[PDB]
Symmetry: C4
Subunit: 465 residues, 4 copies
């Protein structure tokens, strides 16, 4: 029983010395490191193809339909005169009508079946304005009914083998939007021997006048919908037997690993039950009886199996979720690579990181319990006060990123100098920004981070003795 515990907690090498047992688990892990990473790279090929197709098509759409658009300046691209706005709208519609003989890609028109489009309509030109707006800055009066009324113009694609009478209602205009859909085939998914899928891009061009500030920003956004094409033909394409068989091999390897890990977990549970019965005959250690590396391994096994099933679906053309498949496979690869420290824990010369973390975690958790309220106060204050003026405080996640980078001494002078323009106008906000940044930087770089590192190194000093 005590020798049973000895055997159960023995290292793999001394286990092999004891019973001449070849570490089948270790061999499975070693081959798992290679198979999971190879599968991740092979999937990454197709993921790159799909993302590249989407992004390059969006860039081509911007250059085709936005008048005067240049690379960069996706923001700071607006209309400032009525003639500029009219020219932008009419250029977008004209380029839509002239696509098939001016574009470098081959696109197909989608006749209306959806929300803005009527039957036969390919492009919907909608302007939205207040139901009743009497804006008169001269007499400081306005009688406004802020109910948005939508007025759409339907444009039919030319049939080859009205929209220019648009009055825009500038004083109460909310926004002008252009909706159309384009079908295209991802032919680049042919160097990878996968067959080309059929894509449908839903293009939305927005002329945003919600601020009513005399500046109307213009943006173009696309949504891509992948689906299989109808009875396609590729000359001597062949099969992807190798890809399918490798996916099956990865599935089987991860299944064997999962089964062995679950068997070891259940054996440890039975031994824990027997030992607690022994003690009763004669609750923070019975949990210590359990192996957390096996929890990590089973989590990684289920992640890899889910990712491989999703990838098989993607290659069989049913489920087009490249982001989900990539996230699953990448997380499983990371956990698989991390899980080899398990065989460095026994040596006591190689597990310095693991032992130091195990000792340092509670103190770090309490220190974080305090630093969290400090950090959240600073985040909320910075967000709300400096957000309208600072480009790095626009949203809460952006504020968190900026402050976390400042703690590590990144972009400090840029953060300071993004308010030199406000030094002259809103000098009070500029002075508040100075005090806020100086206080946060001093307190967190010099007082808090020092104590964090001190806790970690003190735990290391405890471990090494």
């Amino acid at each position: 029983l005590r020798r049973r515990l000895k055997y159960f907690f023995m290292s793999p090498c001394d286990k092999f010395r004891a019973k001449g047992r070849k570490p089948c688990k270790l061999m499975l892990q070693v081959v798992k490191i290679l198979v999971v990473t190879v599968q991740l790279i092979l999937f990454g090929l197709s993921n790159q193809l799909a993302v590249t197709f989407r992004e390059e098509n969006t860039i081509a759409f911007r250059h085709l339909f936005l008048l005067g658009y240049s690379d960069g300046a996706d923001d700071t691209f607006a209309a400032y005169t009525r003639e500029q706005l009219y020219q932008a709208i009419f250029h977008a519609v004209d380029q839509y009508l002239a696509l098939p003989d001016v574009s470098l890609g081959r696109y197909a028109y989608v006749r209306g079946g959806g929300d803005p489009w009527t039957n036969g309509s390919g492009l919907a030109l909608c302007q939205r304005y207040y139901h009743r707006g009497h804006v008169d800055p001269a007499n400081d009066t306005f009688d406004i009914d802020p109910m948005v009324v939508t007025d759409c113009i339907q444009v039919d694609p030319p049939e080859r083998p009205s929209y220019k009478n648009l009055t825009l209602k500038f004083h109460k205009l909310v926004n002008v939007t252009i909706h159309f859909r384009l079908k295209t085939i991802n032919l680049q998914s042919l160097i990878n021997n996968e067959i080309p899928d059929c894509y449908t891009f839903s293009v939305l061009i927005t002329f945003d006048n919600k601020a009513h500030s005399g500046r109307i920003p213009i943006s173009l956004e696309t949504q891509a919908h992948i689906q299989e094409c109808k009875h396609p033909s590729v000359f001597q394409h062949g099969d992807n037997s190798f890809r399918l068989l490798f996916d099956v091999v990865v599935i089987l390897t991860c299944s064997l690993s999962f089964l062995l890990c679950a068997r070891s977990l259940l054996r440890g549970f039975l031994l824990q039950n027997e030992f607690v019965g022994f003690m009763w005959r004669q609750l923070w250690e019975r949990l210590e009886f359990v192996n957390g590396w096996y929890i990590l391994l089973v989590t990684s096994d289920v992640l890899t199996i889910s990712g491989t099933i999703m990838k098989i679906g993607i290659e069989a053309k049913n489920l087009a979720s490249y982001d989900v498949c990539s996230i699953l496979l990448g997380t499983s690869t990371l956990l698989v690579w991390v899980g080899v420290i398990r065989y460095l824990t026994f040596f006591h010369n190689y597990n310095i990181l693991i032992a130091t973390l195990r000792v340092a975690l509670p103190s770090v958790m309490r220190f974080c319990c305090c630093v969290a309220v400090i950090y959240l106060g600073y985040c909320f204050c910075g967000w709300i006060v400096l957000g309208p003026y600072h480009v790095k405080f626009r949203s809460l996640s952006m504020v968190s990123e900026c402050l976390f980078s400042l703690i590590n001494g990144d972009d400090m002078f840029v953060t300071f100098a993004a308010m030199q323009a406000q030094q002259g106008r809103s000098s009070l906000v500029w002075l508040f920004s100075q005090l806020y940044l100086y206080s946060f930087i001093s307190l967190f770089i010099y007082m808090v981070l020092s104590l964090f590192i001190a806790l970690i190194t003190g735990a290391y000093d405890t471990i090494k003795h």
Copy 2:
């Protein structure tokens, strides 16, 4: 009496064990954390609306009135020929006269009632020059009377249901300025259900020839003056009863918290007086009798109350001070979030930061007493010497920011390379910059910051034992 001191210095949990007292103060603080942050976000909505309106209107004005202006290049935008200057001025005036049928926003003209404008004048075209200037570089002579004479041209807005004869006097010109005012309504303050305010933008276009260097920079600045509109009408607007009631709720919560904190402070003062009388019967500790977290809490309470009153005024349209209101509310939110460490001080496992700071503060103050004179010497020297040549040393605050960023290892190579242009011309200044930067960086990163962190970590080592 000693048990009275025991009770007075007991933690909240042991206080509840002692007298079964529910920590009403703690409950008030907990709900205060939520109410103050929610109020800060709700105010931030309107603050964002106002700041966005101002900035976007200024950008639209720049693009409308500055000839050849593009986004970016707010600096490095100048005239270099007489024809360029004349075209810029005439384009600005022509765009002013053509606004109502070319701009995307709706603006109203303001007839003259102020400093540069006469009765009926909307735009004032003023050039300023020396009273008598005879500049003759050929004979190296000049008879100059440097009294600035102002010559203004008044332009009346077109009345719909002379300025081109401007001689500019280039050889003694000081500056040319264009003044006009525009009224507009912030209609975007309607998605927030607040009613639109009436704004008046005072636009100033400056053609600055003060350097007399053949380059005349052009800039546009605006001042926005918010006021309520006259008898406006919004169809089914409703009230902001919820906003007003939540402001009242925040006020009442902060008032209760302030009253409890002041009661505890006065009780502690009475106990201190009683104890000192006891000692006299039988001055750095009687102050220690006092709670600094209650000082922080009362400061936060008064800040929150002032901010809420100002916000109520803003929503009632009387006081338009968004920067002051935002600064008050953000500072109060930061202090409110910081004030929960007060309940982590008792545990002795969570107040590592507070104890380390309490021990480390005096040594840090003395070390700063020395490093302050070192830092100020470096700041003044850098400012005056490298200011004309370095873009990051233009002003004293900018020098302080640059040096503080250099201490944290930020923008080091950019700071070094901003003088590669001066390596060839003013090689002496380039060499001085090299020595200055190397010396400052070495001395402060390696000698001073190391001792600062050493003081803080030594105080931590004192605390943890």
Copy 3:
């Protein structure tokens, strides 16, 4: 024998005290420091000339042959309409045909003798397309044979004392490439008194349609082939006797140093053999009998000799491998400068770095054995998942550089903000990027790097006592 060991392990100064022996080895090293660095600089002159000629010629070719090309934007330079593509191609060919009377450099045409060019052809205009492509996005069908067929047009340079009928086959176009060669003489290799070499630039202009996304990027790449000119004449050029004699001097100095170092190594081997025989009469220390600074010195000697031979070949016009010669000479210079710490090892006040490294190396190796699997897991995951979306994760080496910079707190906010565009589209990938970056930064800056520095400083603390 023991006094023999004393003499063999004595420092140079005490050796001179013992036998009055002038350290000829030390003198050779001292003069070697100067000769190797001077030779490296002298070679760097010619290396700079050659690299400058190549790069400036490539820039001139880009500006000459790429229509609408501006400095910068080597990427983000593409065609988006059929007319743009045709104009770019025809402009490239027209500039090729008009070079000799429009270019600022003097170039010669190379009639065809190679792969794309026929006899007499100077420029080859090749378009590549699928052998059979029936792309029809309207019916979601395609009958494709993905065998690339090449169609080349041959252009003959004008003879001074057809290509415009190009149909491009857009729907199945793979790429369009322009191949031509230009000969020129590097006249700038005359201020260095070396004679001008004759260069042949092979220019390749690519119009890449492999993505079939409606955007065709355009790039220009050149390959330079250096060779000696036929019977050139420079008036009173003179010889490079000084350069050749200095190369011979460097060779002789390094040869003497190599001979002395090998003699000392063989003497140490003989002494080790004698001592081990002594012990046998009476395996990790017999290797310690050996001097690793002499291994470093012989490696540096052979590197310097190889580099000098290659440099002599370069100046004698036979072997044009400037990159190989520069790498050899620079590595030898670095090792030569490093090799003077050998005379600081004896003092025990100056070899703190060497002793600390000697003590700290094994623990660092084991810690790296663990951190390597952690780092590789993170690298693979980041590469495959964030590569399509993040500009700093495009390739595996780029991922390694990005993560290594993040460990040192560089470009943190830029890395975080390169996904704000994906926050809206692919919010799942944006959230994964947030978690990935936060986890990696925390774990490696705060836990791993702290323990690395702790190991190094603990080894130092061991040494200093």
Copy 4:
């Protein structure tokens, strides 16, 4: 005698306790801190005026005379066709001839009296080419005589109340340069009440064809020569009695401080002599008898006096050396501010920095003796090898700056990614750059800097006990 030593080494406060002596030296230092800084700022005003005039005039000259010049792109501005070069040259000459009626500044022409200009010539148009050049890349031959022949065209300014026949000899052209001088008056030196000086700008426009690579960069450089104008007149200018009297006050304060410091030094020398005589009756401590703060104070006094004399000369219009005056005054201000630590040395609670440095200096010097050879090897290798390819390794000072910034973790990813272009072409150089950067960063950030900080903190630990 021993009480004499007690008095001589007593602190100022205990000296005042001893003999009731008011610290006149301390009072002089305190007023010196203010007077020197005020003088530095007052001089910085005029220094800023002069530097601003020079730089803005150079910018105006660039925009006036360089065809197609835009802000930025001072580099990457070149000609690539013969027509571009001719148009640039002719535009420069035409703008020179049309200055007085197109420029915004008032300039005067300088008829020839110097090197390139003949009598009456204002502009010299010189082209330089090889004396005999027969460049023939077709036959791989050239008969060249590399003696530069200069051919200048003289242009006379128009007389108001030939250069277009320029043949450029492209195949053997070395460079084309345009020389002319312009006189102007710095009128901005009138808001400071200093009178305007007369400036003479020597403009040099270079068309550099030294590389013979088909790309000819174009640059403009100016040299400014300040001198007093002839009998100028400013209406009611007044005197600068205040400035002169304040300069005299600074001179007198620094003179009194210097006299007291030298008296104390000589008294200490006499006491040292007496003590050594005492010891002889009964050499590293007799130097310790001396005060280094008095050496620093006398250095600062002589620097301030020299700077004030130079500033008086500048304001009296004799010596125009603003860079020298600024460097002297700024260095003196820095030393003056540093010299107050002298009164914090006695307290033993405020001189932690000084004591730590005094203890740590020798070990730091030896560690630097080793790290210096390591750093120099890396600097030379990086310079010569990566210089032609990396933008941050172009010169030796730039290499030193880049490596020093890398040690502090600055611009790491930018330094890594400046070779992604060379990954494809010169992959060997790219791989060498990878190895070089990784090795340098690891060795210096993790091994060397750690031991440097360890030495400094160990000296602090010695001091604090």
